[PDB]
Structures are given as structure tokens and as C-alpha cells.
Design a protein around this ligand. Structure first.
Ligand SMILES: [Mg+2]
Length: 210
DNA sequence: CCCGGACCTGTGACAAATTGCCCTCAGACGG
DNA sequence: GGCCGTCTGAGGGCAATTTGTCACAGGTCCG
């Protein structure tokens, strides 16, 4: 299956995208990298890749695309829009998009890589952002270990504001995203909390390949 | 000693959003 | 050449689950 690669600057960038938007973004990076910023999406190709019907494919592309308007990306700082022109359909079942050409160098560079079959069953987008940022540290054999700061997790993944109360962070983000990875990817993941006084400051992740 | 306060934890409720499903019907194409 | 049967896909919806928000009980330590 397609091998996604991206500059580490994109893995650690600040942004908020849905699963459907993140799914399309993978194809943009694949399309762009296999070479002005103009990409294309076929409804029927998307459906076969992700095992959806054409109708629900159509719905996913359409709503994701109009929800891109006004979205911005921040590299740590400098902020950019993903799109500089609205999407449009020349043909039935075909969409044409204009990626901000200034993003190209950030896409292609100190890099991250994973096969598309690893993420296509993940549902929660925050969990996608976590699996991406663990791969950045993975070893050939498939293992690694990394400590991420909690304040940095929140800024980079742009978690909603009520998850700054740690028990909600635990219950609605951390446990759920570890559970999906262990149930939906080939990776086996564990963690432990680092504290300073009463505050929990970092999260320490360990992983191997099955 | 024991107090209210400033911290921390987990859970129970509800609201707002998302999931994969269903139904209709016209376009593009080929037989 | 030109009509129609079929595969697409562009729309309109649903109930069942997940995600996002906050009230309230119960732990600690300090002065
Ligand atoms: Mg969908």
C-alpha cells in the first residue's frame, strides 16, 4: 500500500483537521511528492481505498472540502492557509484543488514515514496525530520511546479547551487514543505519567511492532 | 487542633457532534 | 444514429455512539 512520507515540520505543526480532511491530506502529500500545487481527487478511487460506498465517499469529500475554508497551519512562528482558491468540480466524480504553493517545501525536506494501511482504520483524528508523532521516532525494527510535554501536546494537536482539566484529558483523549492504536494498528503501545509536585507535565510513550 | 481555601483526582449528566446506514433520482456511458 | 438499462454519485434524511462541558464528592497541605 502507499508509503506516506512527510517533513517532520508537518508532523509537529499546529492544526485542526478531521479524519476525512486528514485522509485527503495524505493523498495530496502522495500526489505532490510523486513529481504548482494543483491536485485532483476521484470519488470512485477514494471509495475503493477506504472501503466506503461512492455515495458516502462523495459526502465525505464534499463536506471536508468546504470545511477547509479559513483553516490555517502554524509552524514554530509563521501561519499559513491550506487553500488559496475554492475547490471546484470540472467533471462528475472529480474534484480539483489548489494547495498553497508555499506549503510544498514543508511537505518535502529529518523525515517521518508509515504505510497507509496502518492508519486507515483509525477514527479519532487526535489519535491519528499521535500515531504520526510516534512514527517520527520509530526504529527500523519497529520499536521506540519518547517523552512529549503536555502543554505542547495541547498546542500542537489543538485539543479543545476543556481537556486542560487533566481527568477529562485522561478520560476523553488519552485512554481512547491509546485504545484505538492497540486495536486498529499493528503497534503495541504503553505509557506512564511524569509528574512534578502535584502537576503531571509529560507523557512517556513506549512501543513495539507486532 | 481544626477551619476555608487553593490545589488535585474520578465520575455522573447533559449537549453538541460524528459515525456508518438508508432512500431518490438524474448524469455519463455503452450496448 | 439514438433510446434505454445500468453503474455512478449528488442530494436529502435517521438512530446509535463518540466527543466536549461542567456540577459535585472527596483526597492533600498551608498558614
Ligand atoms: Mg462518512
Amino acid at each position: 500500500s502507499p508509503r506516506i512520507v512527510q517533513s517532520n515540520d508537518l508532523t509537529e505543526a499546529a492544526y485542526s483537521l478531521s479524519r476525512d480532511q486528514k485522509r485527503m491530506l495524505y493523498l495530496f502529500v502522495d500526489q505532490i511528492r510523486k513529481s504548482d500545487g494543483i491536485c485532483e481527487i476521484h470519488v470512485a478511487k477514494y471509495a475503493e481505498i477506504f472501503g466506503l460506498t461512492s455515495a458516502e465517499a462523495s459526502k465525505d469529500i464534499r463536506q471536508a472540502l468546504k470545511s477547509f475554508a479559513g483553516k490555517e497551519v502554524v509552524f514554530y512562528y509563521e501561519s499559513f492557509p491550506w487553500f488559496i482558491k475554492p475547490a471546484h468540480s470540472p467533471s462528475r466524480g472529480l474534484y480539483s484543488v489548489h494547495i498553497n504553493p508555499y506549503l510544498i517545501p514543508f511537505f518535502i525536506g529529518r523525515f517521518t514515514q508509515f504505510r497507509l494501511s496502518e492508519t486507515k482504520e483509525i477514527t479519532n483524528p487526535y489519535a491519528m496525530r499521535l500515531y504520526e508523532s510516534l512514527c517520527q521516532y520509530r526504529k527500523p525494527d519497529g520499536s521506540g520511546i519518547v517523552s512529549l510535554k503536555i502543554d505542547w501536546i495541547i498546542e500542537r494537536y489543538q485539543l479543545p479547551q476543556s481537556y486542560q482539566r487533566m481527568p477529562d484529558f485522561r478520560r476523553r483523549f488519552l485512554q481512547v487514543c491509546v485504545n484505538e492504536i492497540n486495536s486498529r494498528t499493528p503497534m503495541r503501545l504503553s505509557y506512564i505519567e511524569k509528574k512534578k509536585g502535584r502537576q503531571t507535565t509529560h507523557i512517556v510513550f513506549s512501543f513495539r511492532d507486532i
